[PDB]
């Protein structure tokens, strides 16, 4: 019951995902390759939420479908809910995707 | 349903709102166009919250009615809610604007 | 309705408030007159919380009963919810007090 | 009532333990005995939460059961809620404990 909140989690890291994916100066530094503003916009997010990890990625997958969702994988000391949101251009194309993970013990 | 929960992000953005615009570091800062104060008392706030994006507003509007409110812009990209308070001096006189803004993909 | 939500932002400055005020690096800082580590351990919480404003007191009242409570002021352009709790020793004696504040437009 | 709300602070404290305690900057600096990479990810989460104290342990106790839970210690000021949670490696060992804080005044 009081695990069954997966929601209480999972709706944190689908907003999360949302925002995070929307901000312009990392839609622009998804663009221009700009691992290093990527690097710094953010590593303070980390310690700020209380997401177990966070990653941004590029439109094939690299590591810096126009619908957001929440991924459950279950294993090994509980289960990673983590949230999932693309990053779109000023015409909605696909140009990379955040995932925002989390953990239930 | 699970989308309909834009009151979820709209309070956020709302009280949000109302809060940055009535910090009296700001306050001064809008009155006398420290844009570097400003600059370095927003920043923050945006890696801080879960907000899309942040804005300072001038009484006519320039970018550094008493009433709050929410703002809901629909298309392309899902839908942006952006909350809106006045900043208000010792006797009320709108001197500013700020405008916290959301996205719902 | 909405704005009947003072709860919202009022449980939020009373929790803040009893944290803020009983976290063992302030109390330090407290009895120590330390208003420089006071500083250094405030001023981050102000751009973190969606606070207005955030005060240490002392026993006195001066501007570095055992009961938390919260506090509501009325006119000019709303009101401020400022959640209150004491800080104390390892005894108990009030040393100071912290103040937690927020407004409702 | 609004002090039975006890859930309202140990629900944060628990989750709060469980990503805190699942980050893999910390699962490493807790293998490697780094205190001072570890004393880099807690400091800033300090100011961030809410949370009275923060703490970080290792497999026996000391101070740099496959299950999370709520602790809750009551005498002088108030009583103390700290969530805690395990750190664990890629196996699923015990090799630290996590315990966030909590106070209600």
Redesign the interface.
């Known amino acids: 019951t ?1 695990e069954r ?1 997966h929601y ?2 999972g ?1 944190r890291a689908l ?2 995902a ?8 990392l839609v622009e530094a998804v663009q221009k390759r700009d691992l290093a503003r990527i690097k710094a ?1 953010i590593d ?10 966070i990653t941004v990625g590029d439109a094939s997958g690299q590591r810096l479908n ?3 969702y929440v991924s459950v994988r279950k294993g ?3 289960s990673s809910l983590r949230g999932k ?2 990053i ?1 251009d ?1 015409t ?1 194309k696909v140009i990379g995707i955040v995932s925002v993970g ?4």
Chains 1, 2, 3, 4 share one sequence.
């Open positions: 009081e909140l209480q989690v709706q907003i999360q949302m925002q995070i994916s929307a901000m312009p100066e916009l303070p997010m980390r310690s700020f939420s209380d997401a177990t990890y126009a619908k957001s090994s000391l509980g949101s693309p779109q000023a909605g989390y953990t239930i013990e």
